[PDB]
């Protein structure tokens, strides 16, 4: 059998760029919990002993930006200078242009309102896992989530919040469909305390992290493991390693599979097409595959500022479609409402009080079963069987 | 003929995120001009009346970070609050951890040194344009470059630095190769002064910008034009619109085509595999197509921190290869040196004094003919003809 190697990575919730995504979305969630119509463009950056929140917010909400920063950092585990940031003592620069909504005198609706910006977004799905995501991405991501889990539940209390994971999968191409054969290489680089030995780290990573996450059918005697290959990782988080919102957009989506239109998600209210548009095209690609039309699907949408209807839509099934891609395009266009105001309503994205967006801001926006991930709910599609 | 629509965008050099990429790379260039061995991880952010440079630099160079910020902003055209940032008067926060190199007492080499980080990178090429780039990306990008050109040479002196462009191309798929048929939709949203009328903007955009850039063979009576569709754009740049380094990574690469591994380029010295690795795989994909092995090619490489050899390589020719992809993979692996220390040397990336990286930081890292873009020089590949 002819195979090829495809790699995806993940970063842990303590990585300084991901920290910024989480802070940005914790701010967004706080705004929406009080004011579903909040306009939010909240950017975060961080470096040694400092977090700055910036950007623009128009809201009726009363939000303690500094407290959200500190609470978000503390819950991730940044409780001291030694672990890479002291949530209680670090500098927090609050640099947001805060506005209340416009006051106007006079006597646009979701059906007619134009996009708030131009741009393009892609959705992807593949039948190679039950959540219709690429296995290389799923496994890298799940290793990261597992590192967080065993640190917070005390199973591996030697762990610290920062770290990275990476999985190389050996694939076969079946008529355009991606068929995972085996895991070729697993890499973990995790932050840890100054007492645990290299031997304890390697044994615990194998037994508490890799073994539970990676199906045994994909592991064999030849699988390569790189476990903290560069040696010690005691220093982490923002300490000596600046972070910014929107610097993990491939980890947030499909891990190199599919495509990306460039726009980050975190800190953006769900009227913004970079977020709602990307979520709708995930729902569309996932629905094409789940309804049986194809084994794999890529969907693009694009917008112009001030225009409600998309400028373009395509569908590509990588030759796996059971009906022509032009027919799948017609069905997608008829079944999905790509108008900006309508996307936000149909995915129930303004609904407050469930911490929805902070949940998205680590360990991927796609492939998760939580009911707040409304874009993961398949839409039933009618299709003229071949 | 069966066609589909594919969209790519661009932003102008005055867009606040792109401003940050340019500042970050102007800092990098200044470091390398004096000290080719500089370690640079320079991040920039901006908001109304402020730029902050941050991150980490180890260098022997003496660099006036604030002066580089102001010079970079001024040359782009940010000369007043009215045009979106006053380069001479705005706040510049210098927040870099500056170090000199380690002082050590004792009696690694490029061949043996490990990658500085993990991650994966993709290269792409396509025979649909002479520079072996996707037409949707090339045209969006060239419209942006043209807007800058006619503003700076006074042809359209009403222009201001910020703006965005977007092109939808109608394509045909010929045996996996992408064949552009026509331009379906052109969008331009440009910043401008308070005197020019909407009619003058639309006429000058058509005649001075669109007509010279887009080959007439791709334009017809049905092509849709959206010219400043949301109305006036007098306010721009950082004014009310926060920017950050590394938020335009799809514009920096392939416009939705190919793939992306996630890592930004700007502000990173060329020992960093996110930059050198991505540049080498562009050279490899371009070389596969230019040597006649394929019409289209995608190449991935991946790395582990502390390991010199890549963890994985793949090649995909989208069924356009004239020899099997496994044979093209063998040729690429034999012909290219993917070791981090060697990539930097073979692409001559430390060479100082030519403003190389600032040139990359607007209007795309790929598809340009300038001799400093060493990764655009095709390597001759020997291949066992079919
Ligand atoms: Cl403070
Ligand atoms: Cl308002
Ligand atoms: Cl509108
Ligand atoms: Cl928007
Ligand atoms: Cl300790
Ligand atoms: Cl360390
Ligand atoms: Cl369309
Ligand atoms: Cl819908
Ligand atoms: Cl200042
Ligand atoms: Cl040093
Ligand atoms: Cl090394
Ligand atoms: Cl690196
Ligand atoms: Cl004016
Ligand atoms: Cl305006
Ligand atoms: Cl390989
Ligand atoms: Cl080489
Ligand atoms: Mg308070
Ligand atoms: Mg980073
Ligand atoms: Mg000075
Ligand atoms: Mg932005």
Curated annotation (Swiss-Prot), chains A, B:
L-methionine binds at residues 56, 99, 241, 272. K(+) binds at residue 43. GO terms for biological process: ethylene biosynthetic process; one-carbon metabolic process; S-adenosylmethionine biosynthetic process. Pathway: Amino-acid biosynthesis; S-adenosyl-L-methionine biosynthesis; S-adenosyl-L-methionine from L-methionine: step 1/1. Its cofactor is Mn(2+); Mg(2+); Co(2+); K(+). ATP binds at residues 15, 162-164, 230-233, 241, 247-248, 264, 268, 272. It is an enzyme of class 2 (transferase). One of its GO terms (molecular function) is ATP binding. One of its GO terms (cellular component) is plant-type cell wall. It is found in: Cytoplasm. Homotetramer. Interacts with GRF3. HAMAP family: S_AdoMet_synth1. This is S-adenosylmethionine synthase 1. It comes from Arabidopsis thaliana (Mouse-ear cress).
